[PDB]
Write a protein that binds this ligand. Structure first.
Ligand SMILES: O=C1C(O)=C([C@H]2CC[C@H](c3ccc(Cl)cc3)CC2)C(=O)c2ccccc21
Lengths: 80, 79
């Protein structure tokens, strides 16, 4: 059903993200900078948000890259 | 990556379909994410749960009134 479609979509997307991180030397940099900019939409505070990303992004990406796509999708709740 | 952008558009389209046709989908996702707050530890977990509890409604509504391309651009997987 629709729930199972989202799960397979998530596995496909996360597999392509991992490929991107391994083969595209600008991908991670661009994503991290984009997400920092989106911090301003918050009325907590924006610089607090930019600091949180700045300190945790590398570790978050590495953790992500040592997990299977299904595991990541289950973690976020799009699978199971 | 152009593959990631199209994957995100496909996924978000199917999420919106799920929300419109599955009346337990949103509830289950929100509760799942609250449970994952426990991986952060005892004090930081209730903080995390409260953050979800207050932002989830707004996040879902915003998400359902936005085009998939717009959501994917917003998260940074498109453009
Ligand atoms: O069901 C699971 C499961 O859900 C995870 C895990 C993997 C780690 C994920 C994870 C979540 C958050 C962070 Cl910051 C890092 C890893 C969460 C899911 C497992 O590792 C596992 C191992 C063996 C049998 C079943 C299972």
């Amino acid at each position: 059903g629709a729930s199972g479609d989202v799960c397979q979509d998530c596995i496909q997307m996360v597999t392509d993200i991992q490929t991107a991180v391994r083969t595209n030397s600008t991908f991670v940099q661009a994503l991290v900078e984009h997400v920092k900019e989106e911090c301003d939409r918050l009325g907590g505070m924006a610089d607090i948000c930019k600091n949180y990303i700045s300190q945790y992004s590398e570790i978050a990406i590495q953790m992500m890259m040592h997990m299977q796509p299904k595991e990541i999708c289950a973690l976020v709740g799009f699978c199971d």
